[PDB]
Design a protein around this ligand. Structure first.
Ligand SMILES: [Zn+2]
Ligand SMILES: [Zn+2]
Lengths: 107, 107, 49, 184, 116, 50, 162, 77, 295
RNA sequence: AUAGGUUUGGUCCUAGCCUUUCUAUUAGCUCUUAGUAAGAUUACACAUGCAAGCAUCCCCGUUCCAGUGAGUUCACCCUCUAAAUC
């Protein structure tokens, strides 16, 4: 299928100063083998987005493309997992700010 | 330990190898040992030994001299103990030394 | 006929798989053609130096 | 010459005792960690080094597969491992000879060692298989025709034999001849 | 590497010392060194007689079948040994050398008969 | 990766020179019939064809 | 002494003592957990104790942790078909989360021992190569065959002294 | 060994490649034996080729593979 | 049908005959030593640990299968007279494979007679041990499996270890395995250390061989000396089952014998030392009177 | 590291350096046999001898082996797919 190594990656939006493209920071857990401890190692991915729906600070999932479009754009946005501020709790599928329900789940 | 009667011990000294502090600290520890019978009396539980040489046979070494405590010992998952990095290094095999397991004479 | 080791293997595996089937284990030969040492090849599969 | 006498004689507990033979030897070296190999031989030519090993210092202590008490002294008691030469004090030659002495006593029976209870090699223990039972014989074998009859020499006609002479004359060799059957 | 042109070859690889051969049946490219990168080792051949004397051969027959099905070009000692096993038909050259031996033994028998 | 422009150029001009100035069969398969030595090759013929 | 509150979390036996092996369908694990509140205590313990084990036994699964964004702690699993698995973990414990994820999308002992058996299929005893991969380098070692010329001198059938 | 740009020595500038002299019937039976042996090893080789192709095809899509795939999908659901 | 060694009733009976002495099964052996671990638990978890040790003892004491001897295989696959006289010394070929069982692997021998003979049993075992080595087995036959060595071993009273070495070296269907096991059993029937062979897996194989080739008088003697009376009655039951046409079985089912009376019937019918086994039974009954008066 | 020597008029602590262990190269002195492993310091210059032929002409091979450590993240995995063997 796709020749892109990173199939599904969840990251954070950094800059939207490229039009139709989003710059995303994807951080994984890498083991430092002497301390035997997991530390976050970060990589920058370029994602193709058609609708300009993602702003900076959003948490976005990136799916791979069958072929890279540009020299660096090898992914496309699939869904905005967490928009800034307006965080819809998925468990009780309701809007919330953080740690507090903006509108009550007892509706 | 030849004057005491001990025959089978490992002992690594570190910090200042001062002879007069070495002897005194050794005697402090060897007189502040806690034995199996004292452990059994303190915890109210049976003290058992499981050797790899014999197998799964449990060998009771020390029993409480009074009543037997009936609620079991609390299994603290992921115990909070202070480990030693030299021991962990030796167990995992990154202790690369040309001095450790050298062929020496008797005792 | 199959070579004697192969014959032993395939008969043993068939009695292990079930039915005795004591027929002599023949394989087809007439599929293989008989080009001798005079048949010519192609120059394009060949090539001039 | 014959061992298993000295170790229950009197001079063994006169000079030695219940203590092992090697419980008196201290090898001389540059101090600290000893060299991780003893001498190769105490007896060079027929002369002895000034600090002989526990075996070489007493010529009465013969080593073979029947000196059971000596061999148990030189093997560990709570572990089934043979003591190494820096640990004991014996030569490289003496340690080698003691090692074959331990092995010879172990496979001759005059020594106790631990043997683990082993598991069966296989799971199915049947004997009805083509490699381990009878096979239906070949038609050639119930007859006497050679297997794959192109092995046998069959004389070609003189016509294509003369064709081969036409192809390879000039540098031709000598003629044909049928195979012999039985060798001397 | 790449080895422009070539094929796999189930061949014997020497792995012994001086005055002691030992061969390992390996599946190697034709263009690679004799003792080099083999894709898989498929057996062993001891030509030396034992104390009892058995000249040992060990073959991984299913993997031999697999590599022949994948297209391995077997070498002349390999067909010699596989024919001696009975996995392959016996080789025309080894039975022809046997035949040459029959005829030279016939020659020495007749010469010794004339001598005696 | 720094490009190998001069190597590609040499490859192209070698292929072109081979396609244009290829030797022909007349000067390729001629035979000096008394010594069996072909010109432009220098190799004689096998013993099955003298 | 090793630094940290629980030094046993970094001992390479705890890490290869975790038991969950993720299937090949999953790619992303996301743990939204709450740093405060008595109800997200199990999620906090799961993040503290078991995420190193999960990441050690599944090295190519991207695991991302999120702090106080939602009022309820939950796990999300993004799977390569495009699946978005949700497991809320409020009113739970770390071992309960362990068991839940190994039941839902952990591999079975069936597949795990089959994979180990395939590794054992790769390892072969009869092969004769260097000790890095094989067990015997030659038949110079097995008794009954001719010994190596280095260890035992060969008789005068050797050539040179033919 | 040598390359395409090594000059030839004089002992191979001139050296006759004399042919091995030929026997009639050992040669003819050698042709017959060779052609029979090549035919039967061609049969064995195509047998093994079909066997390998069969193993590949049944591993990719047989009946047990489909059974395991559908069981895995049902378990997942 | 005559029940064999692989049947549930005879297996349960031989299990009860062997018995489980934990201190003898899990015994300190002279191997490489690691520092022991310690645990602290209550009486209930101590009973749990002892029950798990008992289960592990059963796993360790799972019985070795007693099997019949093997027919020496002599099957010529092919004979190449053209090949005869070409080479000098034989050529052994082994299908090593990886997944086919060992007793299904194909090993052949090409001889200077041109005969492609399937390999013999000993050559088969030697090639299997060469190419698929198992821990403890050496292809050269150990010198300890000789008359004087085995006699010294028997004198040093290590018959369980005799059986262990024989199990490690020879396959259970081998003639050497059979001969060594029965020679050890004959030596222990001569001297007699059935307690030395108790709580070992070879105990019921010993019992099976003696009841098949009847020398069970010493077994009954040691049983009633060591008060294994239910074991003794069960062993006479095994005698009656394995030999149902015996006059002991006839008189037993005629007299409806159940226990000590069944032992008496066997003693009066076919015990070669019937006077001594009856005398020891009378002394055991005198002991019964003594501790019944004590009770 | 089972560690030891050394700061000082002396003691304690911290510390460096060194010793004891094993291997490889070279130098000195000195050397009996047998077997086996391994064997330019230099990407400096090379006399000379050989190292690619085969084969009914065509082709094929000389693009492989063998050598060196100059340069140096072109070595591993996945996708796609051209020689090549079936
Ligand atoms: Zn000495
Ligand atoms: Zn060797």
């Amino acid at each position: 299928r796709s020749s892109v190594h990173a199939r599904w990656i969840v990251g954070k939006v950094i800059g939207t100063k490229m039009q139709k493209t989003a710059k995303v920071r994807v951080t994984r857990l890498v083991l430092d083998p002497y301390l035997l401890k997991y530390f976050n190692k970060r990589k920058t991915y370029f994602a193709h987005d058609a609708l300009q729906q993602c702003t900076v600070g959003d948490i976005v999932l990136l799916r791979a493309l069958p072929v890279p479009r540009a020299k660096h754009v090898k992914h496309e946005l699939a869904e905005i997992v967490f928009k800034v501020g307006k965080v819809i709790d998925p468990v009780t599928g309701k809007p919330c700010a953080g740690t507090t329900y903006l509108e009550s789940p007892l509706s | 330990c030849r004057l005491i009667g001990i025959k089978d011990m490992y002992a690594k000294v570190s910090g200042s190898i001062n002879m007069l502090s070495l002897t005194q600290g050794l005697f402090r520890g060897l007189s502040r040992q806690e034995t199996h019978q004292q452990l059994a009396d303190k915890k109210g539980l049976h003290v058992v030994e499981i050797r790899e040489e014999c197998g799964p046979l449990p060998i009771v070494v020390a029993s409480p001299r009074g009543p037997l405590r009936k609620d079991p010992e609390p299994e603290d998952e992921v115990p909070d103990v202070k480990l030693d990095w030299e021991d962990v290094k030796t167990a995992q095999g990154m202790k690369r030394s040309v001095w450790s397991n050298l062929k020496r004479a008797a005792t | 006929p199959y070579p004697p080791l192969l014959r032993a293997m395939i008969i043993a595996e068939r009695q292990k798989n079930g039915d005795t089937s004591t027929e002599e284990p023949m394989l087809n030969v007439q599929r293989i053609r008989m080009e001798p040492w005079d048949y010519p090849a192609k120059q394009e599969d060949k090539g001039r130096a | 010459d014959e061992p298993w006498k000295y170790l229950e004689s009197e001079e063994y507990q006169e000079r030695y005792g219940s203590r092992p033979v090697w419980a008196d030897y201290r090898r001389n070296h540059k101090g600290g960690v000893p060299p991780q190999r003893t001498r190769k031989t105490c007896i060079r030519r027929n002369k002895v080094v000034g600090n002989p090993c526990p075996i070489c210092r007493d010529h009465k202590l013969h080593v073979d597969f029947r000196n059971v008490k000596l061999l148990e002294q030189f093997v560990c008691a709570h572990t089934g491992i043979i003591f190494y030469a820096p640990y004991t004090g014996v030569c490289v030659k003496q340690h080698k000879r003691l090692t074959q002495a331990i092995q010879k006593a172990r496979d001759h029976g005059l020594l106790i060692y631990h043997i683990p209870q082993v598991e069966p090699r296989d799971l199915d223990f049947s004997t009805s298989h083509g490699a381990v039972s009878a096979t239906p014989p070949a038609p050639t074998l119930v007859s006497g025709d050679p297997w794959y009859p192109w092995y046998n020499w069959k004389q070609p006609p003189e016509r294509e034999l003369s064709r081969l002479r036409r192809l390879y004359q000039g540098h031709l060799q000598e003629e044909s001849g049928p195979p012999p059957e039985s060798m001397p | 590497k790449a080895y422009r042109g070539g094929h796999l070859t189930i061949r014997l690889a020497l792995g012994g010392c001086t005055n002691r051969p030992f061969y390992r049946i390996v599946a190697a490219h034709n263009k690679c060194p004799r003792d080099g990168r083999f894709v898989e080792q498929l057996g062993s051949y001891d030509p030396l007689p034992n104390s009892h004397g058995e000249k040992l051969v060990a073959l991984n027959l299913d993997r031999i079948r697999h590599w022949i099905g994948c297209g391995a070009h077997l070498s002349k000692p390999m067909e010699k040994l596989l024919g001696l096993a009975g996995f392959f038909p016996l080789h025309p050259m080894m039975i022809t050398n046997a035949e040459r031996l029959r005829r030279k033994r016939a020659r020495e028998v007749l010469l010794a008969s004339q001598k005696t | 990766v720094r490009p190998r422009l001069i190597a590609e150029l040499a490859r192209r001009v070698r292929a072109l020179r081979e396609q244009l100035n290829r030797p022909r069969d007349s000067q390729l398969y001629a035979v000096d019939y008394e010594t069996l030595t072909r010109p432009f090759s220098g190799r004689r013929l096998p013993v099955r064809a003298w | 002494p090793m630094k940290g509150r629980f030094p046993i979390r970094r001992t390479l036996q705890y890490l290869s003592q975790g038991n969950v092996v993720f299937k090949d369908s999953v790619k992303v694990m996301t743990v939204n957990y709450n740093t405060h509140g008595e109800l997200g205590e199990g999620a906090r313990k799961f993040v503290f104790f078991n995420i190193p084990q999960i990441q050690y036994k599944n090295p190519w699964v991207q695991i991302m942790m999120f702090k106080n964004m939602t009022p309820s702690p939950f796990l999300r699993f993004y799977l390569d078909s495009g699946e978005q698995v949700l497991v809320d973990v409020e009113t739970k414990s770390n071992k309960e989360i362990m068991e839940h994820i190994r039941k839902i999308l952990g591999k079975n002992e069936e597949t795990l021992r089959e994979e180990e058996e395939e590794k054992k299929q790769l390892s072969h005893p009869a092969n004769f190569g260097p000790r890095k991969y094989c067990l015997r380098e030659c038949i110079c070692e097995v008794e009954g065959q001719v010994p190596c010329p280095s260890l035992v001198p060969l008789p005068k059938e050797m050539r040179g002294k033919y | 060994r040598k390359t395409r740009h090594d000059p030839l020595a004089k002992s191979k500038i001139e050296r006759v490649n004399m042919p091995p002299a030929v026997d009639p019937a050992e040669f003819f039976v050698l042709m017959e034996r060779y052609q029979h042996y090549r035919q039967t090893v061609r049969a064995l080789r195509m047998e093994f080729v079909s066997e390998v192709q069969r193993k590949v095809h049944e591993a990719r899509a047989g009946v047990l593979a489909e059974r395991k795939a559908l069981k895995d999908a049902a378990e997942h659901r | 049908k005559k029940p064999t060694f692989m049947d549930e009733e005879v297996q349960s009976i031989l299990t009860k005959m062997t018995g489980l002495n934990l201190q003898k099964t899990f015994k300190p052996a002279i191997q490489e030593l690691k520092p022991p671990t310690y645990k602290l638990m209550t009486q209930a978890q101590l009973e749990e640990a002892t029950r798990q040790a008992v289960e592990a003892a059963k796993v360790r004491l799972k019985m070795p299968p007693v099997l019949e001897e093997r027919v020496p295989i002599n099957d010529v696959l092919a004979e190449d007279k053209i090949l005869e006289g070409t080479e000098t010394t034989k050529y052994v070929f082994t299908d090593i494979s990886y997944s086919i069982p060992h007793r299904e692997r194909f090993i052949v021998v090409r001889e200077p007679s041109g005969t492609l003979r399937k390999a013999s049993w000993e050559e088969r075992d030697r090639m299997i041990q060469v190419y698929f080595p198992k821990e403890g087995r050496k292809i050269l036959t150990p010198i300890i499996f000789k008359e004087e060595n085995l006699r010294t071993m028997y004198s040093q009273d290590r018959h369980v270890d005799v059986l262990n070495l024989c199990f490690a070296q020879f396959e259970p269907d081998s003639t050497e395995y059979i001969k060594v096991h029965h020679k050890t059993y004959e030596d222990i029937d001569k001297r007699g250390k059935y307690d030395l062979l108790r709580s070992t897996r070879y105990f019921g194989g010993m019992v099976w061989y003696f009841v098949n080739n009847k020398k069970i008088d010493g077994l009954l003697i040691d049983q009633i000396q060591r008060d294994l009376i239910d074991d003794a009655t069960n062993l006479v039951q095994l005698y009656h089952v394995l030999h149902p046409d015996g006059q002991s079985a006839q008189g037993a089912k005629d007299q409806a014998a159940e226990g000590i009376n069944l032992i008496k019937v066997f003693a009066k019918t076919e015990a070669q030392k019937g006077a001594y086994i009856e005398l020891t039974l009378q002394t055991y009954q005198e002991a019964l009177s003594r501790h019944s008066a004590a009770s």
